[PDB]
Structures are given as structure tokens and as C-alpha cells.
């Protein structure tokens, strides 16, 4: 009962293959869970090596041969487009759920019963999530909570040393773009830049924008205080006769004379620019003048600008000009003849940074730039990639926390509490039937994988840590008090996540649980494997 050029799995072979693939994927992503996890090394074969820990990036870049593993990875990748985190959690939950389901199936439990039990446990876990969350306040002085959230997000991705650098940077960058008002949050207001030949710890935060192109004249001021930003779209390069002409001569002296005569066109515009500079705070103290000049500038015009204590850039990207239109408030002048003071903007200190391979300009310290820039600094490609990924993850986590005020303490407290709540309530109710108890117990046990994996990664024995956490929870319940009990990966004993400062996003946990349950149900319902199209 088969056809050529095809292969199929019969009886329970499909279930065994799917379970094995899920276990393999879990073991692949088991070691990188939590701040105590490890990093994976990826080689593309072209000489580029990536050292990454984020589950989404690892799944996207890594090639997967097992079709079931491919399906699991693709399903878990949805977390990135919804919550931005929890892919590893989804994979671990799917793996443990499939392990338990296979164990029960070996005892004769039909897959549909397990699926129904998983659905019931999912509903109960959603109820527990609703009852267990903590409402965050809307106070504008919540900077401490944002710092705690950023630290929690970063510790999972960094070596615990760059955390002190990235936490304040991420917190400030996210807070500046989203003021203490309803409005809205858009992470596109935060620019991400990378620089080479610098120490990893050099990463800093810039209030405003940073321009790639720098000055090209030694006499330009290094720093300009309270500068007026001028954006000019008219090219200041050498101009020729407006009508048909040429350079026909017997000696280069005639060509030089013709060039000097033709330079008057640029000279006239330079005169207007200098007049504007002089009129607007020409000699006022603590004032400056900076010109962007999107288009190119002739060296003679650069020297003319420098001799007037004017810092002029050239050959800037249109995107940079559009960003400056808001960062500095200045407008782009299409024609010098219509140039007027109203075009000029205003900005704080303007500093030029010289690098061996390039030169940057800073246009930060703006009254209301409605944007900010984060400068990732590193000496190696992998370090820069890791820093960028950590910064983006922290930005997304803080944005999710700000937009969604529902906050749930982490440190493994949520998973253990949910497992206990399920084991109690589902067994006390038995709302569907006894036969669903197998699936209920499987789901409850699988939900405990995350704390066990975290403890295993931290090097401590999961049994003792789980026993201590359960004992503390039992004591709290006997005391008739509300208490959150988590896992301290540094000491090994139990700890209160609300005091240490470990928190998890409501959306992340909700989506991870839903996705894991859905993937487990879909895989457990696979009766056979079919091959076609060959």
C-alpha cells in the first residue's frame, strides 16, 4: 500500500518522529535559556561567524532538516512579530508537552484526549494569568521600574557587565521618545548606529541625531555652542557659464582666469550665506552657526566658510536632512536668493568626532528633537551584532511594558504558581471528565520545564530549588497571604521577584502559552506522514 518515489510513516511512527524532533529542538535551545545560558556559534561558510543567543535569530539563521523541527521553529517565530520574545520559552514548552503526551500515549491515552486536556489547561492558565498579573501605575517617575525591566531584559542577552551600560541607555532612549502622555510609542524614533575600532563598553546614548559626514577644513571649530542649523539644497561646487561655453586656450593661465570669472556664481551665494550668518547672532556671545549643505561644496567655499568661524558639512544623505528637519527644526532652502533667518534652526553643542577611517558630527542637545540615537561601539563584528541585538530587545521590552501596563513577576514564579494552580483547580473541578486528567497532568508538568531549565543552566540542582520554592509557597498559602516566590539563580535559594527586580511581560507569557499549546495540539494530532510531489 505505497507508491514509488514516496515515503510515509504508519501506526505511531509519525508521533515518535515528531516527538524526537521536538526533543532535539528543545535540547538545541535548552542551553540558551535564562541569563545563565550559553551562546551558539553559527558559521555561514563564507568566513562570517555569528555568536548569538536570541532564540528568534538562532532559529531564523540556522538550517533545520527535520520537517517537524522546521514547523516548530516557524510557529515559534510568530512570537517575534507579536511580542518580540519568548521563542525559547515556546520551544521548551512544546518539547516538554510533547514528551509528556508521548509518555501518556505509550500508556494507551488517545491523542485527542490529550489535546482536550491541553485546551482545558490552557483556559485555566489564561484565567490564572488574568488573576495573577500586577497592574503598573501611570506615574511619570517610574524610571526605577523601567531600569529594572531593562536590566531584566539585558541580563538574558549580555555578559552581565554591559548591563550597567545598556540599561540606562535603553531606559532613557525609550522614555524620551514616549513622554508621560497617552500619545503613542514608535521605536522608529530611536536610531541604531554601529562604530568600529572602539571598546564594547564605550556604548553611549545621544539625545539627538548623529551625522555621518564631517568637516573637511582644519580651521572649522571643533565645537560650536548654541549653533543655528542651516539646511541648503543648492550645490556650492564650482559652477560654469549658464550658457554654452568651454575652455579653449594656449596656456593654462587663460583657463585659470576663466575659472576665476565663473566662480562669481558660487561667490554670490556664499556672500548671501555669510550675510545671513552675520545678521543672525553674528557677534552675540554664546552663539554659533552651522550649515548642513546637503549638496557638495567646493574647497574654496569650504575655506570661505571656515574663515568665518562657520562649521559647514557637505554631501549628506536625504534621510539625514529629513531627520534634521525635525531634530533641529530648520528648513531646507531650495534657493539662496530666498534665504532668510526663518530657515535657521537651533541646536545645542555641535561636536565633530575624528576616527581613523571616518569622521562623525554630533547635532544633539535639541529643544524637542522628537528622536534619539544610540551609538553601538565595538571592535569585532560579533560584539557589535550582540550589542545591537541586546539594545533592540531591551527597547522592544520596555516599549511593551510602557504600552501594556500589565506586569507579571518573573524568576520562574509564574510558571510554578500556574502549575500548582492547575494541579489543584483542574483536579478539584473535573469539569469535562476523568479521562482528561492525563492531559491536565501532562500540561501541568510541562509548564514546570522553564524553572527546571533555568536552574540546570545556573548549575544548581533543579530538585532542591523546586522543593524550596514549593515549601515557601505552601507556607505562604498556610499563612493566608499573597506572596510571589521565585528562583535566585545566583544564590540557589528562593527569592521574591518583586523585590529583586525580575519581571516578565504579560503579552509575552500569554502568547508563549497559546503558541506552545497550539503547536503541541497540532503535532500530537498528526496521525501519519505523507509524501507527494516527487
Amino acid at each position: 500500500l505505497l507508491n514509488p518515489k514516496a515515503e510515509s510513516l504508519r501506526r505511531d511512527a509519525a508521533l515518535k518522529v515528531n516527538v524526537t524532533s521536538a526533543e532535539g529542538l528543545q535540547s538545541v535551545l535548552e542551553t540558551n535559556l535564562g541569563p545563565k545560558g550559553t551562546l551558539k556559534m553559527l558559521v555561514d561558510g563564507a568566513g562570517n561567524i555569528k555568536l548569538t543567543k536570541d532564540g528568534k535569530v538562532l532559529l531564523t539563521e540556522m538550517q533545520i532538516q527535520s520537517p517537524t523541527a522546521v514547523l516548530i521553529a516557524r510557529a515559534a517565530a510568530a512570537q517575534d512579530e507579536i511580542t518580540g520574545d519568548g521563542t525559547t520559552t515556546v520551544v521548551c514548552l512544546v518539547g516538554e508537552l510533547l514528551r509528556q503526551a508521548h509518555r501518556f500515549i505509550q500508556e494507551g491515552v488517545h491523542p485527542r484526549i490529550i489535546t482536550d486536556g491541553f485546551e482545558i489547561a490552557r483556559k485555566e492558565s489564561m484565567k490564572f494569568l488574568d488573576e495573577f498579573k500586577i497592574s503598573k501605575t501611570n506615574l511619570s517617575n517610574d524610571r526605577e521600574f523601567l531600569l529594572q525591566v531593562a536590566r531584566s531584559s539585558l541580563l538574558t542577552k549580555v555578559d552581565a557587565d554591559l548591563t550597567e551600560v545598556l540599561t540606562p541607555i535603553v531606559t532613557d532612549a525609550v522614555l524620551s521618545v514616549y513622554d508621560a502622555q497617552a500619545d503613542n510609542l514608535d521605536l522608529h524614533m530611536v536610531e541604531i548606529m554601529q562604530m568600529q575600532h572602539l571598546s564594547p563598553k564605550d556604548t553611549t546614548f545621544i539625545k539627538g541625531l548623529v551625522l555621518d559626514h564631517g568637516g573637511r577644513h582644519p580651521d572649522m571649530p571643533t565645537r560650536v555652542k548654541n549653533a543655528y542649523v542651516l539646511i541648503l539644497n543648492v550645490s556650492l561646487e564650482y559652477e560654469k557659464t549658464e550658457v554654452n561655453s568651454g575652455f579653449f586656450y594656449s596656456s593654462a593661465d587663460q583657463r585659470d582666469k576663466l575659472a576665476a570669472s565663473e566662480r562669481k556664481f558660487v561667490d554670490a551665494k556664499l556672500k548671501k550665506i555669510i550675510d545671513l550668518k552675520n545678521e543672525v547672532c553674528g557677534m552675540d556671545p554664546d552663539k554659533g552657526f552651522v550649515i548642513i549643505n546637503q549638496k557638495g561644496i567646493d574647497p574654496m567655499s569650504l575655506d570661505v566658510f571656515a574663515k568665518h568661524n562657520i562649521l559647514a558639512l557637505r554631501r549628506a544623505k536625504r534621510r539625514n536632512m529629513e531627520r534634521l528637519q525635525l531634530v533641529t527644526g530648520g528648513e531646507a532652502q531650495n534657493s539662496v536668493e530666498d534665504l532668510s533667518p526663518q530657515i535657521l534652526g537651533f541646536s545645542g553643542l555641535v561636536y565633530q568626532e575624528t576616527i581613523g577611517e571616518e569622521k562623525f558630527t554630533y547635532v544633539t542637545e535639541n529643544t524637542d528633537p522628537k528622536s534619539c540615537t544610540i551609538l553601538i561601539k565595538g571592535s569585532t563584528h560579533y560584539a557589535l551584532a550582540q550589542t545591537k541585538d541586546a539594545v533592540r530587545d531591551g527597547l522592544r521590552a520596555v516599549a511593551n511594558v510602557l504600552k501594556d501596563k500589565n506586569i507579571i513577576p518573573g524568576a520562574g514564579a509564574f510558571y510554578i504558581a500556574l502549575s500548582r494552580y492547575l494541579r489543584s483547580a483542574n483536579m478539584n473541578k473535573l469539569g469535562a471528565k476523568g479521562k482528561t486528567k492525563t492531559g491536565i497532568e501532562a500540561f501541568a508538568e510541562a509548564l514546570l520545564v522553564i524553572p527546571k531549565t533555568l536552574v540546570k543552566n545556573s548549575g544548581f540542582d533543579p530538585l532542591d530549588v523546586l522543593a524550596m520554592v514549593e515549601d515557601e509557597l505552601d507556607d505562604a498559602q498556610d499563612s493566608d497571604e499573597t506572596r510571589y516566590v521565585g528562583v535566585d539563580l545566583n544564590i540557589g535559594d528562593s527569592c521574591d521577584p518583586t523585590i529583586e527586580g525580575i519581571w516578565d511581560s504579560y503579552r509575552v507569557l500569554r502568547n508563549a502559552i497559546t503558541g506552545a499549546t497550539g503547536i503541541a495540539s497540532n503535532l500530537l494530532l498528526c496521525d501519519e506522514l505523507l509524501r507527494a510531489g516527487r
Binding site: 514509488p4 485527542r112 505523507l530 516527487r534
Partner: protein
């Protein structure tokens, strides 16, 4: 190359069984999922029976024939895509030992299968229960089963009404001894296509008792509302005409180029007068229409539509009765499409309309669907197609049969009881068919996670000693009364599934060898 003896029959039966076993688990709400693995790295976990039977490649010709049968039934009938294959495969498997072990000739098996088909149809008719096809409440309740628990669950309330209204508009309930029973001549594919109108809500959707045309007036100075419309259809364009053979235009003076325009005016005027001779109110031409022709037709007091596709005219001739004449000079007074309702062009949702409805029964209509987005419109269109197919199945025979395998179990029991009294060699295939009918309840029990043996035995005992309305519960998995739980399926689907499965089994049994040939 060549296969002789029982080997060819064994090969065909094995191919049929292999095809059936794949989808054996595609029945019931508890249907299991399947993995489709392409030669590349992509795969899906779709559980749709049609998708499984479509994406599965089979080398054996019998499997290809079975897949083609299922694909054809997927459009001929609204349901039973997987039931037909499962039933045919089970029947073939049951008949296999008789052909192989009992040395029974295929002709006897085929005849017995046909007789069992007749008996099964009789039993299905006996066990079916009537429904009220005239009361809208009963039809809405029945059709809600195929509309709820879907993307259109939100608008189900109005979706049921829209589908029922469309089906009734295309449904012709007639009974007499002169022309016979038309069988309602329901055609959804051709004359029920849904028109997607952006904007509005589902509750705003209406059923047009005719054809809706999206062609606006070809000239602003044209009537937009006729209370006594009459449609005339033509193909030949109204413009300058050249000779059948090569035609050359030779002009000496520049001003003489107006001769072509004068000839065009003369010909167009003659054609327009010929068209107007039949007292028309709207002129539809498949080919292009010149501005002069539009002016001449307007002078006669009628509207003009040009470059209209044949698809519109095919339905216009059905809802208006207008006869299309290729040549204008051959137009006849009797070709005018009288008995037309209106030419109203009221715009809905910033879209152009042209209603050609009436209070007649042309067995054609148009569904004016409204929605808040294109995705909603497409999903509602698909759900309305499914609901109208279900309603057509229900209304083609005012009765329904119990679901959950009760009908199959009752058919098996009655077939066994009748076969016990036949007293002939054919008794064996009748028992094989009766046993194969048990496939559906076995699949339901297996998908529900119950006992495949004890539950089936209890159901069979209940049918033998109790009523035939007992079946397998989709959720509980126990033996319960289908009527109490509201589990039902249309009788038409069951009859068609049984007939097609038995006919396919007979056809496959007829083939006793596969030989190379071109």
C-alpha cells in the same frame, strides 16, 4: 506490461485500500491532522480532506480514478468528498476475499453491488425525516450548521437569510404530470455568483431577482430609469463597415476624407433604425459602438451599452429573454426582450449598478454583497457559496437523515436482514456492503478515542432492537440520540455518496488488467 489472473484485481483493490486508508481519519469534528511533505523542505499540517486528496500523488491508475471521482464530487455535491472514497475502499476491501478466496466472478459482485445500491437508497429514503422547506425559520436553523463556528460566525444571522433568499430565488418549486418534476433546477455556479460591493454591512446585503450589470451609461445624456424596459442584444458593431475582402480607401483632396465619415453615418443610421424598429429601450452590443450610433439610438429614446462581455448577455437572455442576433439587418421584432422589470441604476457604496430584476422565475439571480473590507467580502463570498450548496442539497429533497453514522448503521442492519432472505450466491456481496457501511461509525469512534469494538457493538444492538436515530456523539464519543443532540446531514448527500461509492467500486472491479498503449 500485462497482468493476468487475480493479480490485476488484487493490485486494483490494494490501490483503492491505500487511497481510502489515508483519509480514513478525515471524518467527524475530531478528525486527526496529517503531514504533507513535499520533496523540498516545506510541509503543512492541513486536515482538509479535499486538500489531502488533492496534494497526494498516486501512481496506480485506480488511485488516480478514485482521486478524480472525489474531485468531481467536490463540485457536483457540497459534501461527501472523503465519504465517497472511504465507502468505496471499504466495499472493495470487503468484496476482495470473495473474488480472491471464494473464486466469485466479478460480474456477480457487480450485479450484487448494484442491487445493494438500490436497497441502500430505499433504506435511506425510509430512515430520512421531513423538513419544512417553506418555513424560513427551519431553513435558517438547518443552514446555520454550515455557517456557524466559522469566520462568518459574526454575521451568521444575516448570512443564513441571504443564502436562503438566493437559493429560493433560483429555486423553482413546480410539480405536475405534464412537464414532470424539474428538481428545482438549482444552478449556483453560473447564475448565483456573488457581487462584492465595498462598504456597508452584511445586514445591508440584498438578493436581486435578476442580473446586475456594472456597465454604466455610455453617454451622460441618456435615460437612467425605464419603467417599461425592453432589452435587445446584438453582436455586430455600429460603426464604419468595410468589405469582406481587401478594402482600400483612396482620397485625393484632403476635404474628401469626410466621405468615410458620411458613409459611416449612413450605415450607422440604417443599423440604428433597424434596431429601433423593434421598439427597444436598451441596446447592448458586444462589439464597439461608435459615438454616432450612440447619438442615433438616443434619438430613438433608448439607452446604449457597448463592449459588453458575452457573460453578461448569457444571463440577460435568461432573466430578460432578449434574443441576440449577430447581424443588425437580421434583427426581428420577436427578438425584443419584453417582460423586463426595470433599468434602475441606483448607486450603492459609490459603485455603479444596473438592475434587471423582475417578479418572474428565470432560475437566475445576483447577490449584492456588502462588507467593510475586501477580506471580509471574500470570506463571506466563500461562506455563502458553501451555505448555498448546503441549502441546495437540503431543498432538492425536503428531508434529512440522522448524522453520526446512524444512517450507515441502519443501512447495514437492514441490508443484512434483507440479504438473509435472498437465498442466492449473491448474498455474500450484500453482506460485504452491509459490513463496509460500518466504516463511518468506526471512524467516528476511533476519532473520539472510544472503544472501537464495544461502542460499535452497542450501537449495532441499539439499531437492531431500538431506533435508527442513535449515533456517535462528536464530543462525548458515546452512543446518543442524534435527534436530541441535533446531529443531522442532508439525505441528498447520503444518497449521492452511497451511489457514487458503489458505482466506483463496480467500475474498478470491471477492470481486470492494465496494458500499455498509446
Amino acid at each position: 506490461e500485462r497482468t493476468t489472473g487475480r493479480q490485476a484485481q488484487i493490485s486494483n483493490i490494494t490501490a483503492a485500500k491505500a487511497v481510502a486508508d489515508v483519509i480514513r481519519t478525515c471524518l467527524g469534528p475530531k478528525a486527526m491532522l496529517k503531514m504533507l511533505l513535499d520533496p523540498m523542505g516545506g510541509l503543512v499540517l492541513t486536515n482538509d480532506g479535499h486538500a489531502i486528496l488533492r496534494e497526494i500523488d498516486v501512481a496506480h491508475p485506480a488511485a488516480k480514478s478514485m482521486l478524480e471521482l472525489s474531485r468531481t464530487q467536490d463540485e457536483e455535491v457540497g459534501d461527501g468528498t472523503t465519504t465517497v472514497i472511504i465507502l468505496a475502499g471499504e466495499i472493495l476491501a470487503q468484496c476482495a476475499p470473495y473474488l480472491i478466496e471464494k473464486n466469485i466472478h466479478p460480474v456477480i459482485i457487480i450485479q450484487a453491488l448494484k442491487k445493494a445500491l438500490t436497497d441502500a437508497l430505499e433504506v435511506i429514503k425510509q430512515v430520512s425525516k421531513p423538513v419544512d422547506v417553506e418555513n424560513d425559520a427551519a431553513m435558517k436553523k438547518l443552514i446555520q450548521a454550515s455557517i456557524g463556528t466559522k469566520y462568518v460566525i459574526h454575521w451568521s444571522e444575516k448570512m443564513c437569510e441571504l443564502a436562503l433568499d438566493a437559493v429560493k430565488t433560483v429555486r423553482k418549486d413546480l410539480g405536475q404530470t405534464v412537464e414532470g418534476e424539474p428538481n428545482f433546477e438549482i444552478d449556483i455556479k453560473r447564475y448565483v455568483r456573488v457581487e462584492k460591493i465595498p462598504g456597508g454591512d452584511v445586514l445591508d446585503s440584498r438578493v436581486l431577482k435578476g442580473v446586475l450589470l456594472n456597465k454604466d451609461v455610455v453617454h451622460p445624456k441618456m435615460s437612467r430609469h425605464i419603467e417599461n424596459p425592453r432589452v435587445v442584444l446584438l453582436d455586430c458593431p455600429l460603426e464604419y463597415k468595410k468589405g469582406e475582402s481587401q478594402t482600400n480607401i483612396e482620397i485625393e483632396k484632403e476635404e474628401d476624407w469626410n466621405r468615410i465619415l458620411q458613409i459611416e453615418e449612413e450605415q450607422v443610421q440604417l443599423m440604428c433604425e433597424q434596431i429601433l424598429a423593434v421598439r427597444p429601450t436598451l441596446v447592448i452590443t458586444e462589439k464597439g459602438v461608435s459615438d454616432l450610433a450612440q447619438h442615433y439610438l438616443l434619438k430613438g429614446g433608448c439607452s446604449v451599452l457597448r463592449r459588453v462581455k458575452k457573460s453578461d448577455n448569457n444571463r440577460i437572455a435568461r432573466v430578460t429573454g432578449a434574443t441576440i442576433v449577430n447581424r443588425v439587418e437580421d434583427l426581428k421584432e420577436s427578438d425584443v426582450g419584453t417582460n423586463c422589470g426595470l433599468f434602475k441604476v441606483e448607486m450603492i457604496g459609490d459603485e455603479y449598478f444596473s438592475f434587471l430584476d423582475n417578479c418572474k422565475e428565470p432560475k437566475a439571480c445576483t447577490i449584492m454583497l456588502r462588507g467593510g473590507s475586501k477580506d471580509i467580502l471574500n470570506e463571506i463570498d466563500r461562506n455563502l457559496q458553501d451555505a448555498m450548496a448546503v441549502a441546495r442539497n437540503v431543498m432538492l429533497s425536503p428531508s434529512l437523515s440522522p448524522g453520526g453514522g446512524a444512517t450507515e448503521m441502519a443501512v447495514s442492519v437492514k441490508l443484512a436482514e434483507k440479504a438473509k432472505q435472498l437465498e442466492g450466491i449473491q448474498q455474500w456481496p450484500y453482506q460485504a456492503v452491509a459490513d463496509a457501511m460500518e466504516c463511518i461509525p468506526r471512524t467516528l469512534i476511533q476519532n473520539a478515542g472510544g472503544d472501537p469494538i464495544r461502542l460499535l457493538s452497542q450501537l449495532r444492538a441499539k439499531h437492531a432492537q431500538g431506533n435508527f436515530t442513535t449515533g456517535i456523539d462528536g464530543d462525548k464519543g458515546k452512543i446518543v440520540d442524534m435527534v436530541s443532540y441535533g446531529i443531522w446531514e442532508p439525505e441528498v448527500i447520503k444518497q449521492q455518496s452511497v451511489k457514487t461509492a458503489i458505482e466506483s467500486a463496480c467500475l474498478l472491479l470491471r477492470v481486470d488488467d492494465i496494458v500499455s498503449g498509446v
